[PDB]
Every structure is written in C-alpha cells, then in structure tokens.
From a paper:
A related group of proteins with a similar Mn/Fe cofactor is termed R2-like ligand-binding oxidases (R2lox). Following O2 activation, their cofactor catalyzes a two-electron redox reaction which results in the formation of a tyrosine–valine ether cross-link in the protein. The tyrosine and valine residues are conserved in the R2lox group, and the cross-link was observed in both R2lox proteins that have been structurally characterized. Both proteins also comprise a hydrophobic channel leading to the metal cofactor wherein a long-chain fatty acid molecule is found, which coordinates at the Mn/Fe ions of the cofactor. The mixed-metal cofactor in R2lox self-assembles with the manganese ion in metal-binding site 1 and the iron ion in site 2 if both MnII and FeII are available.
Moreover, A171, which lines the fatty-acid binding tunnel, was changed to phenylalanine (A171F). The latter mutation was designed to create a cofactor geometry in R2lox more closely resembling the R2c site by blocking access of the fatty acid ligand that co-purifies with the wild-type protein and coordinates both metal ions. In A171F-R2lox, the fatty acid is excluded from the active site because the bulky phenylalanine side chain blocks the ligand-binding tunnel. Electron density for a hydrophobic ligand is observed further up in the tunnel, but it could only reasonably be modeled (as caprylic (C8) acid) in the oxidized state. In contrast, in the oxidized state of A171F-R2lox, E167 is a monodentate ligand to Fe2 as in the wild-type, whereas E202 adopts the oxidized or reduced state conformation in roughly equal proportions. However, cofactor oxidation by O2 appears to have taken place regardless of the E202 conformation, because an oxo/hydroxo bridge is clearly observed in the electron density in the position occupied by the fatty acid head group in the wild-type. It appears likely that in those molecules in which E202 is in the oxidized state conformation, a second oxo/hydroxo species occupies the bridging position. Accordingly, the A171F-R2lox cofactor can adopt a geometry which is similar to the oxidized cofactor in R2c, with two oxygen bridges instead of only one as in wt-R2lox. Judging from the electron density, the cross-link was formed equally efficiently in the presence of O2 in A171F-R2lox as in the wild-type protein (inset).
Author numbering:
A (entry chain A), B (entry chain A): 2 to 286
Amino acid sequence: VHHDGFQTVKATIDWEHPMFKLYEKAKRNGKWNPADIDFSQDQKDFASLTSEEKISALPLVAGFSAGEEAVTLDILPMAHALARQGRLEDVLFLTTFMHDEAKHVEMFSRWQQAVGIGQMDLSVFHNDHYKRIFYEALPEAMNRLYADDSPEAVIRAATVYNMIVEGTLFESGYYTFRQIYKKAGLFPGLLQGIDYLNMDEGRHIQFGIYTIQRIVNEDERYYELFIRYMDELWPHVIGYVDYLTELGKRQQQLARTYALEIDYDLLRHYVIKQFNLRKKQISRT
Amino acid sequence: VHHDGFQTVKATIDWEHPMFKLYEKAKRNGKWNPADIDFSQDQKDFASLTSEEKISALPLVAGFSAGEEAVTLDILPMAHALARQGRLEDVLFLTTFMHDEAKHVEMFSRWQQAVGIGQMDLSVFHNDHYKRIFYEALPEAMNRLYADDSPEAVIRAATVYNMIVEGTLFESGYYTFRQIYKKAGLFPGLLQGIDYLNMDEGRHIQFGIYTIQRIVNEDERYYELFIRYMDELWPHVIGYVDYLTELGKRQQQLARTYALEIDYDLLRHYVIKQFNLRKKQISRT
Ligand SMILES: CCCCCCCC(=O)O
Ligand SMILES: CCCCCCCC(=O)O
Ligand SMILES: [Fe+3]
Ligand SMILES: [Fe+3]
Ligand SMILES: [Mn+2]
Ligand SMILES: [Mn+2]
Ligand SMILES: [Mn+3]
Ligand SMILES: [Mn+3]
C-alpha cells in the first residue's frame, strides 16, 4: 500500500528516540566479522577429541545453529509491523538486529565447516520441546504480525523472541558454553565468536524490553499477558534443559578428561534465574 | 508457518553462492558511519548562500531523502519472499542491503538537521511523476511479494527497485550532485556521504542483476517481461527529470555565482544512458 509521506522529508529522525540511540550503539559496537575469526586451533582441538568427547559438544551447537537461523528468518515480520506503524527509529535499529543475526548464523556455520562436521546433520539433538519453541511457537508468533499487529500480538512476539529465545535460552547456553570450554581451554575461536554474539544480544534484549514496556505503559493489563506468555513457554524451556542435562549426564567423558565438575544443578538454576530476571525487567506500572 | 528444518544444521552455508560472496564484500566495505561525517562546513556553506541559491539544492535532497526512506521500508518484502523460498545466502546479503539503506536515510537526515532545514517540509519538490514511482509503483511492486512470489513478481520488484530507482534515478542523481557541488566546492560532508552511498549502491544493483538474470536463465521469455517493465516506468523517470530540469532552468542563480555551465542536455543523456545500460546487464540467453 502507498506511502502518504516520509518523515525525513517532512521532519527529521527523532534523534532522542531510545531505539535511535540503540541503533547508534549497534553501529559503534557491531563491527566484528566472523570471517576474521581463526578457527585453526578449533579444528585441531576437535580432531584431538575422542568420539565420545566429540558428542559432548554437538548438542549445544545444534541448538545454537538452528536457533540463530530461525531468528534470522523470523525477525522480519517485526520489522514489517513496526515499519507499517511508522516507527522509523525502531526499523533503523532492527536493520542492525537482522544483520547481527546473519553474522551469528555465519559464525556457527563457519565453525561447523572448520572442525569437519558440516556434512553432519545435527537435527537429531532437537527434541520435541526444542521443536515446539523454534520450529513452531517462534515462527507462529512472529508471522502473526503480518496480519495482526495488535498490542497483544506484539507483546507475544517480543516475549517469545526476545525474552524467551534470546533472554533465557541463548543467555543460558552462552553461560553454559563458557562454563565448560573456557575452563577446558578448548575451542578458542568459537568462544571468541560467542563473546561477540553475547554483546550483540544485549541490544536485542533491550529492544524487547522497550517494546514490551511501551505497550504495558499504555495499559497495565498487558503486564498480565506478558507473565502469562512467559509461563506458557517455561515447560518447553525446561524440557529442553532437562533433555540436554540427560544427554550430558549420559556422556560424562569430557568432564572426566578435562577435570570439569559440570554442575547441572547450577546450570538449571541459571536458566530459572534468567527466566525470572526477564520478568523483573518489565514494570507493571 | 513452521520451519521444516535448518540449512546450517543439516549442512552449512553455500560458501560459493554469489550472494554469499556479495554479503562478504558488503561487510568488508560497509563500515562507514554517517555519525562520523563532519557537517560543520556544510552548515556554513548553506548559511552563506542567498535564498535563491538555497532553493537550487533542495529539490535533489528532497528526492534523495524520501527515496532512501522508501527503499528502507520497501526492501523488507523481498527479504521475506526469498527467506520463504529457502534462499539463505540471499537473505544474509539482504541484511546488509537493509542496513545500508538505514544509514542512507540517516545520512540525509543528519545533513538536513545540520544545515538548518530539518523543520522544513521538502515534499513540495515531489511532482506527480515522482509520487507515481516512490509513493505508489515501488511499494506496490514490493508488497505484492507477500502474496505472490512468482518469477514475474520477483522480476518486477527487482526491476522497479534495483534497476529503475537505484540503477537509473539514484545513479543519475549522484552524478548530478557531483557534477554541480563538487565543482562549486560546496557541501563537503554531503559529498563524502554520497560517495559512500554510491559504493553501497553498487552491491544493491548487483543483487538486482543476479535476481533478474537467474529468473531469465530459467526461461528467456522473462527477458521480455523485464524490458516491458523497464519501458513502463521510463515516462515517469523522464517526467521527474524534465520537472527538475525545469526547476533548475528557473533558478539559474547558483550556476552564475559558482561559474557552473550546468548542462541539462548532458544530464538528461546520462539518465538515458543509465536506463539503457541497465537493460544491457541482463542477457536474453
Ligand atoms: C543446561 C542449559 C542449557 C541451555 C542451552 C540453550 C542452547 C540454545 O539453544 O541456544
Ligand atoms: C537531472 C536528472 C536528475 C535525476 C535525479 C534523481 C534524484 C533522486 O530522486 O534520487
Ligand atoms: Fe539475538
Ligand atoms: Fe540502494
Ligand atoms: Mn517432555
Ligand atoms: Mn507530466
Ligand atoms: Mn543471535
Ligand atoms: Mn540507498
């Protein structure tokens, strides 16, 4: 449908808009390039591993790789919906968000290729709870926005995408990955890339907080929708966590080799802590 | 709708895909930041101008500013359509395209703000032919892709967006701007920014060529659709050109002051040349 006018012809950008400020920070802080990461040591590390130790690492990489690819595809309807509402500064920021996620997809795929598992199908490590979030609930909630950009729909999309997928699952998975392979001294290239992902993902979560809060600000009853949508997804979050925990407890060979007391009870509580602090970044009032 | 799988879990990125290579070049060559351009001299230049000389420059800036904003909003459906076709490397590249266009919107709006015309509504310099392309034909052709991603629809979208708007109008407007203010020694910040835009816009046109050619490759009868769609838009392209030419010939005070023989007959032929060379970058066979 037609444009009825253009904000940067009638006026200018709103320079004080928080999403313009987040866009400015994204450009300053978003220069890293996955093509510059040296993965040569990661290739040697992975080759030096036993077949048993090789499994230990792949579940998390399977969840990350599909997850980055899903959000790369699935952020587009948010950008559409906010563009159609005339939120120009939000759109500008979302271009950095989308470009970040492209680099995240690229980074994991470069690592898979470098270490020699690119020809290997990692979908086996997606159980039913993972599929429910990433193959179903995430794309349903984002795609809805093409036909329904009601406050309810926008809160649900930001909750699933930014508060659950990024703010709970990815944050916990990054913690987990550091807590294991940084200790073991393994996979330096991948850990460099993950550190970059984690920096980008702070801006993505901030966008989600801003979006949810500005809707709650209009009407505190949206607050209850937010909590409800968070709690509806919790079972699949912990059901993927329990399944990875069960996979890790079945293959405790890397823990032994590298002298890691992988405390799954401590990981689990980090997931719970992440989930609960995302709730507290949204004020009812 | 659901994801049935993820390419970077089952396989990797197709590293040899031309759009992956264009994505790689976009990251290497896309570091510039409009926030780093010094516009202080542009502010003084614009203040030093007479009111008559002030008009001379605004028509082109009005067309650029609305144009960048239109393509920022209107590239999203292309990214959607190709994502839904599973063209992952195209999507990765299109994230750089979208982020480039955000910076183009930002750059013109920073210049308008710096020189003191931000509070001024430049829509008056959009005649009916401009509105037909940017307010109507462009968004219609891109938005169509949400419901109709047939080869015909994709060629039409790339033709309007990449071959006409970028490949004819923007290219000619950049030439024009250099041919005038680079000669006059005016507006150094804006000319720096335009030089950056022009570098980005080479990649955007290449995406359009690749997209049109790969469809023509399937069936040379799409070639005739391409030419037809180019010729349908030509009247509005030259009708905006004739109208800017008429505006420039009515305000020949900047030419006098700055000793510029602004050869509109030479500009006009550059537009015609641009239009015809875009046609020749698509092979029938
Ligand atoms: C032990 C808890 C692990 C949570 C890992 C989430 C990984 C992901 O899919 O991004
Ligand atoms: C004298 C020919 C001028 C063509 C200017 C196109 C400017 C634009 O809208 O990008
Ligand atoms: Fe993210
Ligand atoms: Fe462009
Ligand atoms: Mn279960
Ligand atoms: Mn006319
Ligand atoms: Mn990511
Ligand atoms: Mn542009």
